[PDB]
Amino acid sequence: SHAQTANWTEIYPGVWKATVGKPESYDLLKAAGAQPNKDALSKTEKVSFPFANGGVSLEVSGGKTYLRFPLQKEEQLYGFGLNFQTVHQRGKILELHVDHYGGKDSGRTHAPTPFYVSSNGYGVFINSARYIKVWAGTGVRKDSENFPTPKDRNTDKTWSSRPYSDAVEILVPAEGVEVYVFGGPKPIDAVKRYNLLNGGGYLPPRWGLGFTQRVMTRYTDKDVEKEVNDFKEKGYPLDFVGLEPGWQSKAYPGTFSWDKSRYPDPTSFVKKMKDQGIRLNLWINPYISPDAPFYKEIKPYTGSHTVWLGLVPDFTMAEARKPFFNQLLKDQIERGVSGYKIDEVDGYDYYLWPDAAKFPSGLSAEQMRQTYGLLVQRYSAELYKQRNERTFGLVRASNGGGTSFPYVIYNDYYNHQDFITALINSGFAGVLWTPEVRASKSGEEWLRRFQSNVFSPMAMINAWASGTKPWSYPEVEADVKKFALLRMQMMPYWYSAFARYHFEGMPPFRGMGLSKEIKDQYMAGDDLLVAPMFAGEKSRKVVLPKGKWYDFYTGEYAGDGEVLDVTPGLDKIPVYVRDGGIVPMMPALLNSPKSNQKVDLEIRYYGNKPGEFKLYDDDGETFNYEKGDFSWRTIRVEKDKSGKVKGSISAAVKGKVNTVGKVTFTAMTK
């Protein structure tokens, strides 16, 4: 080691920054244009520097930046991006490249966030848009304090093929790097500070938390109108419809212009849908057809290589952004289109541009690959913010720096177990992930997928190919409908969780904690432990943290710091509520409520510990909250001496939006 003396500047409470060597002029935070939530960070506890006892070794050598952070024997690690099959990361080796998930945890994935969290209550972010390699406690150094005694494999039964390693080591292919370290005291505190450095989560519109149906590629405007009428007639919720590539006059590559045959009058169509409460979310990939109206203008500002024969705009250049985003604005957003699904900004390598490609800005194709999703998210979101309108959409790649964007990750993979593991890991990765529903061999699988999906960032069927609707499997149709309605009833719960994401950096879906690895349970909001069932299973084990827990459906005591064997039936996803936990429920509305609408709330209170819930309220759709037009309404509930429920809600704040109607309290635990 020739560890270079790097000064750790405490830049916010519990956030330290170090500059090793000569960092590059482009990086993840710069690509994203991520601004820290200074106010939120200033309210966090000043905590001590996590690496109090030395062991940090950062240096530049041979054109690369070498990092080493110490580990203690007790420590487990989480993060290093959107893994699908692993949650404990100590002992893993990962190569953090943006790619479509390939079926194993190599580090190559949709959001290969270079951030990790320790069970000892700290985190570390490497701010590079390069491909980086991580050895998360596999290296064993001859000069280590903790060098294990060499053993003779010939004779010693305790010989180990993976001897004890006492450090995270990272190699960055650059002449320097910025490193951020986040204090605790708890693992979740580190994640929160990381997310706040990124600007906090996006505050979604309420409509983004409703149900979305993506329809078949072939659908015309009339086909969409019919589908909407079918949802209404069947009494299923719907807030936004996803149009797939058929809305464009050409796709792969794209014109970013409405097809004249299928959408002959886009202005009328979008308005008609909006009038029925239905927003539209449009599929794009960013790859340009010679028939796009801005093709000639943008061509010089595109890369050397194409993706499905489409030009690749260099979105680091104003000269590429202006034509591209102008077309979205004038042709779609100004007609009322609510947002986008940004597809195919991930991989595979055989589709996207090679790293040997060249871009007109001079940015490496590598850094472009690592940030392309960030860039499209960034500049598309800005179009909406400029109009004082929230958006909420989908994206197939993100990275560090992307916490604040109004996009949820999805993919073309489908293993349900792994979809839940990704949901867990999204909480460690500063991104949102939806385990989307598409098809299923069976009603049972359809319902199981639907159940976990309504306990996620976005409630969605993607029927681009399958043409399925929530009711397409008659055997589970009644229960699908109940869960679709439950998603709406729970809107005030999800909205308050997302508000915590924005204001405090609290991921709304996260792993347990926050000894053994748990890859199939997650916290959803602060109060709910979700333990999905998978098709073919009649029962599962649920590991409950210490403290009492209550059945979400019945309110009955479930357990306390123990393992349950649960046989929920097909009609229930196992969900448990913390003692004193509160779930505010609005009515089973088919459409998200408007800013000028009051909604009655039933406060479902579980257990016997006095409960406290902070209900977020604002207009649900603009950026007026940035000017202070929002409120947190404190709800408190307990049972009195008689065992009867007693509840309060703090008074509405003068001058602020108030969508809270009549409030009733229900003690779920009899």
Ligand X SMILES: C[C@@H]1O[C@H](O)[C@@H](O)[C@H](O)[C@@H]1O
Phi and psi at 434, nearest 5°, equal -115, 130
The nearest distance, CB 179 to ligand X, in angstroms, is: 11
Which of 127, 125, 95 has its CA nearest to residue 112? 95
Rule CB under 6 A: is residue 594 a binding residue for ligand X?
Answer: no
Burial class (CB in 10 A: 0-12, 13-18, 19+), 256: buried
Stretch that binds ligand X, among 101-109, 257-265, 323-331, 575-583 (CB under 6 A): 101-109
What b/e readout covers 37-57, taking b as 16+ CB neighbours within 10 angstroms? Answer: beebbeebeebeebeeeebbb
Least distance to ligand X, CB of residue 513, Å: 24
Return the number of the residue (288 or 582) whose C-beta is nearest a second copy. Answer: 288
Three-class secondary structure assignment of 440-473:
CCCHHHHHHHHHHHCCCCCEEEECCCCCCCCCCC
- Contact indicator for 215, 241 with CB cutoff of 8 Å: yes
**412 sits near ligand X (criterion: CB under 6 A):** yes
Nearer to a second copy, 299 or 639 (CB): 299
Q: 637, 661, 656, 504: which is closest to 583 by C-alpha?
A: 637
304 binds ligand X per the rule CB under 6 A: yes
Partner interacting with residue 62 (select from ligand X, a second copy, none; CB below 5-8 Å by kind): a second copy
Which partner in ligand X, a second copy, none is near 163 (CB below 5 to 8 A by kind)?
a second copy
507: its two tokens? 């991921």
361 binds ligand X per the rule CB under 6 A: no
Question: Would you say 143 or 640 has its CB closer to ligand X?
Answer: 143
Q: Residue 39 contacts by C-beta under 8 Å, 6 or more apart in sequence? A: none
- Partner whose binding site includes residue 472, from a second copy, ligand X, none (CB under 5 to 8 Å by kind): none
By beta-carbon proximity to ligand X, the closer residue of 3 and 478 is: 3
Which residue lies nearer to a second copy by CB, 63 or 536?
63
Q: Based on CB atoms, which residue is closest to a second copy, 169 or 346?
A: 169
Contact status, residue 451 vs residue 573, Cβ threshold 8 Å: yes
Q: What is the per-residue binding string for ligand X in 103-142, x denoting contact by CB under 6 A?
A: -x-xx-----------------------------------
Instruction: Burial-class residue 519 by CB neighbours within 10 Å (0-12, 13-18, 19+).
Output: buried
Report DSSP state, residue 352.
S
How far apart, in whole angstroms, are the C-alpha atoms of residue 262 and residue 567?
Answer: 48
Residue 21, interface with ligand X (CB under 6 A)?
Answer: no
Write the DSSP symbol of residue 207: G
Is residue 161 near ligand X by the rule CB under 6 A?
Answer: yes
Peptide bond into 507 cis (omega under 30): no
| CB of 356 vs ligand X, minimal distance in Å | 4
CA 365 to CA 345: how far, in whole Å?
13
d(CA 303, CA 326): 20
- CB closer to a second copy out of 175 and 526: 175
Q: Based on CB atoms, which residue is closest to ligand X, 147 or 348?
A: 348
* Phi, psi angle pair for 181, to nearest 5°: -115, 135
Q: Give the residue with the Cβ less far from ligand X, 358 or 656.
A: 358
Q: Which is nearer to ligand X, 97 or 416 (CB)?
A: 97
63 binds, among a second copy, ligand X, none (CB under 5 to 8 A by kind): a second copy
DSSP state of 651: P
Question: Do 400 and 114 meet the contact criterion of CB atoms below 8 Å apart?
Answer: yes
Shortest Å distance, C-beta 152 to a second copy:
4
Q: Which does 49 bind (CB under 5 to 8 A by kind): ligand X, a second copy, none?
A: none
356 near ligand X, judged by CB under 6 A: yes
Peptide bond into 253 cis (omega under 30): yes
DSSP-derived 3-state class of residue 316: coil
Instruction: Give me the phi and psi of 625, to 5 degrees please.
Output: -55, -30
221 part of the interface to ligand X, by CB under 6 A: no
Sites for ligand X among residues 315-354 (CB under 6 A): 344, 348-349
CB 659, min distance to ligand X, A: 38
Give the one entry of ligand X, a second copy, none that residue 162 binds, where binding means its C-beta sits below a cut-off of 5 to 8 angstroms depending on kind: a second copy
Q: Quick one: which segment of 65-73, 270-278, 419-427, 615-623 binds ligand X (CB under 6 A)? A: 65-73
- Least separation in angstroms between residue 256's CB and ligand X is 17
Whole-angstrom distance, CA of residue 205 vs CA of residue 626: 14
Residue 61 host element (H or E): strand 57-61
Q: Give the whole-angstrom CA distance, residue 212 versus residue 195.
A: 26
Min dist. Cβ of residue 125 to a second copy (A): 18
Q: What does the alpha-carbon distance between residue 47 and residue 70 come to, in Å, rounded to a whole number?
A: 19
Residues that bind a second copy (CB under 8 A): 1, 61-64, 66-68, 91, 93, 133, 135, 138-143, 147-154, 159, 161-163, 169-171, 173, 217, 245-246, 248, 250-253, 259, 289-290, 299, 302-306, 308-311, 349-351, 353-358, 362, 364
Looking only at the bridges linking them, the beta strands covering 630-639 and 599-605 are: unpaired
For residues 320 and 517, give the distance between their C-alpha atoms in angstroms, rounded to a whole number. Answer: 46
Q: Which option in ligand X, a second copy, none does residue 387 bind, with CB closer than 5 to 8 A by kind?
A: none
Q: Which amino acid is at 561?
A: G
Q: By CB under 6 A, name the one of 93, 317, 518, 663 that touches ligand X.
A: 93
Give dist(CA 44, CA 47) in Å, integer.
9
**How many residues make contact with ligand X (CB under 6 A)?**
25
> Binding residue for ligand X (CB under 6 A) from 17, 24, 47, 68?
68
The stretch near ligand X (CB under 6 A) out of 59-67, 426-434, 516-524, 608-616 is 59-67
Q: How far apart are CA 502 and CA 106, in angstroms?
A: 30
Closest contact distance (angstroms) between CB of 432 and ligand X is 20
Pick from 24, 169, 227, 527 the residue near ligand X by CB under 6 A.
169
Sole binder of ligand X in the list 13, 33, 91, 95 (CB under 6 A)? 95
Tell me: does residue 66 bind ligand X (CB under 6 A). yes
SS3 (DSSP) at 231: helix
The residues binding ligand X (CB under 6 A) are 1, 3, 57-59, 66-68, 93-95, 102, 104, 106-107, 161, 169, 304, 344, 348-349, 356-358, 412
